[PDB]
Amino acid sequence: MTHDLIEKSKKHLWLPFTQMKDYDENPLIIESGTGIKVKDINGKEYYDGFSSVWLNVHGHRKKELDDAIKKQLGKIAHSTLLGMTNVPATQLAETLIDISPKKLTRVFYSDSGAEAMEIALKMAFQYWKNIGKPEKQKFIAMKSYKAPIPYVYRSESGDPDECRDQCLRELAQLLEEHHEEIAALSIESMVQGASGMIVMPEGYLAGVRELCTTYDVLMIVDEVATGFGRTGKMFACEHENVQPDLMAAGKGITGGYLPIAVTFATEDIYKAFYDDYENLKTFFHGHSYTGNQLGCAVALENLALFESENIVEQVAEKSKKLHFLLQDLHALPHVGDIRQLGFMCGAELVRSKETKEPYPADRRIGYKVSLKMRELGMLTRPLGDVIAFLPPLASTAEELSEMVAIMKQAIHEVTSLED
Amino acid sequence: THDLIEKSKKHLWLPFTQMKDYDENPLIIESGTGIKVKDINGKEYYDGFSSVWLNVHGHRKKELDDAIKKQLGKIAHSTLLGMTNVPATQLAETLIDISPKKLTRVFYSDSGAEAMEIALKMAFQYWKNIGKPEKQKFIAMKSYKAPIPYVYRSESGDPDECRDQCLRELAQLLEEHHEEIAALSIESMVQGASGMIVMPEGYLAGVRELCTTYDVLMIVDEVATGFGRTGKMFACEHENVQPDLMAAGKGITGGYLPIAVTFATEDIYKAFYDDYENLKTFFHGHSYTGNQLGCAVALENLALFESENIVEQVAEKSKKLHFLLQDLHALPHVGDIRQLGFMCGAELVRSKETKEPYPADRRIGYKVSLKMRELGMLTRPLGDVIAFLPPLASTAEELSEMVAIMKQAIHEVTSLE
């Protein structure tokens, strides 16, 4: 029965990033998917409006991807990368090196995007110790030490450039007086995802790259949310032509089918761990399913679809009519901000335009909208009161428009009643 | 092909491996069948370490292949953030059925390492949520440090004495520090990467008793020992111990895909269950959590455990495995053999009366591993401990074939110091 599936789900599960009480009152259990839609156990279909949490590229039950996994099963599902390697992980690594910024020449596999970033930090940490400067041991976290990222929406000036230069100036001052103790800087690539789909103003990222080079601090670029076509580029750091020292990737790498993550490094960083085992230069980390054949085999096929379906350039083109559709959401009294880079978008809801006072958090306004969209046939995740919109890269222009329409209807319906 | 070899040296950066070593002796696997793998040159190897302690039924197991192809016909991945899917829901029920009584909750992640980190987050935040933020430190077993028994390197060589000594050091530590301690983290029955050291009879149960007495959460690591490896489904069954938190992975999927789990009691779960405003949510998790493809193969893996009574015959085959390993003990540089089920280790030593280790210098474990490779067998040394963790599907004849190769290899490298 379907009512006992539901019952067993709230008895045995503990779900990530969710208040289980919320899950218990509004369960949803997915059974299948095809194209850009998923279907629950009652047969109700939804638009994957968030690409299963921004990792689904070509939709579900993408035949080429289905076949690439079946093909790989005919050989071997998993052999280890500890001390040795396998065919698909080696082949993928070459293809990954080709499509990434030019100075990134090394691929270290891991199991999640979060582990890839932790790996980037250990690499940066050990890097300085290995080249004889163990005083460089602190990190700059871009919101250790904290530096501000520009958020133009709520921001005294409301100016992309003033916000850019003012934040850069704060970074610049932090380096000036701490840099000799700092190993690295970690920053999302063009878009702050979880912090509300906040797009960086032009010149900002190229500007922190520049400061990092000047202060001998490694720059870690997190591309887990933005990588593989999401922003209309293969990697988002191309928007500003920045070369990372370290780059984390995952999610869409497999077209969204399986867990694979990568930390890219430069050759200069790589060679600081290359030496006789005796002189202790080895980077002692890495997991047990790292470079899983099944995940690498579906990734290879994923990147073959990018190149044979000009996916990145389709995203960039489709993003043009998407712009106008999203900008029309401003017609609603409780929108307030619309942010977009490629298929990476957010609509920040407010109780009042130009005070921009948010709703009190206890009004659950992002969550109520997510729930309304859900009854309307569309899945997405609210980040606070920002409605995220990250549809599959393979999303049609008509599918794009159907999704924005459901989103607009949901925002209006919840929000018309709040105040 | 031939080209692959240099490509791998140019593009990869491998985990826990000095790349200069890899370049000098590259190994690139192309396929597998049963408990053997084959490299790009056609050479076959016994998978003597189960692809690092995760491969259960061998490679290209029909039922596991079929379970993934079937799940592909439905959906590969949909999220567990705020919602769920059928395979992850079904699997959770099954994992609850086969895990210790007191564990009722399944939290998914991507790796066994992540499962353990989640367990610590659960413990740290549990105490905060119920108004004991002072309980924020941890005991890690070898933050605070207490000793695990290493009977071979002990001055009594007596299990009970080593056990009781290490328990009273834990006691002493808890007595003065308990009010600041959130949790204690320990491997279940066997210290894996530390060199395959089997815990003495009564020790784990003893640590469970002290955690309960001093109100500290017991986090149990079953990532390496889990799923029949030690001749029980979970090694903690050996001493009937009930964890508060338990990390698992590896063999969960028969070794096919990355799925990991953190088990929890309902008491711990409830401290995060509240109306959203009360700020009690466990805000952690990730992307491919409860992946359908991984959960699908895991469900089938577990069905095979049942229909093939994997556990009852790991325990059976271990009996004769004991004798094969004890004969290995006859080599002048095998100082110790440790075994619990299919989890074994041969600690190498410059000489036995002295138990004196080779200088790490000489790379004895490493050159034994390379020798074994030449001989058609893969394993990973832990320092100068040669690990032997063969697939649970290994036959009695395959075990002895693998032991004979290990023996030859230790003999040739070692007699040669």
UniProtKB/Swiss-Prot annotation, chain B:
Reactions listed under catalytic activity: (8S)-8-amino-7-oxononanoate + L-lysine = (7R,8S)-7,8-diammoniononanoate + (S)-2-amino-6-oxohexanoate
Activity regulation (UniProt): Inhibited by 7-keto-8-aminopelargonic acid at concentrations above 80 uM.
Assigned GO CC terms: cytoplasm
Localization of this protein: Cytoplasm
Pathway(s) annotated for this protein in UniProt: Cofactor biosynthesis; biotin biosynthesis; 7,8-diaminononanoate from 8-amino-7-oxononanoate (Lys route)
Cofactor: pyridoxal 5'-phosphate
Highest taxon of the lineage: Bacteria
List of residues binding substrate: G285, R380
Keywords, sorted A to Z: Aminotransferase, Biotin biosynthesis, Cytoplasm, Pyridoxal phosphate, S-adenosyl-L-methionine, Transferase
Chain positions found as N6-(pyridoxal phosphate)lysine: K250
pH dependence text: Optimum pH is 8.6.
Keyword hit for Nucleotide-binding: no
GO biological process: biotin biosynthetic process
Disulfide bonds: none
Enzyme Commission number(s) from the entry: 2.6.1.105
One function term, GO molecular function aspect: adenosylmethionine-8-amino-7-oxononanoate transaminase activity
CDD domains per UniProt: OAT_like (cd00610)
Enzyme class: transferase
Sequence positions that bind pyridoxal 5'-phosphate: G112, A113, D221, H286, S287
PROSITE patterns documented for this protein: AA_TRANSFER_CLASS_3
Protein family per UniProt: Belongs to the class-III pyridoxal-phosphate-dependent aminotransferase family. BioA subfamily.
General function of this protein: Catalyzes the transfer of the alpha-amino group from L-lysine to 7-keto-8-aminopelargonic acid (KAPA) to form 7,8-diaminopelargonic acid (DAPA). B.subtilis is the only bacterium known to utilize L-lysine as an amino donor in the biosynthesis of DAPA.
NCBIfam families registered for this protein in UniProt: bioA
Subunit structure: Homodimer.
Name the UniProt record assigns to this protein: L-Lysine--8-amino-7-oxononanoate transaminase
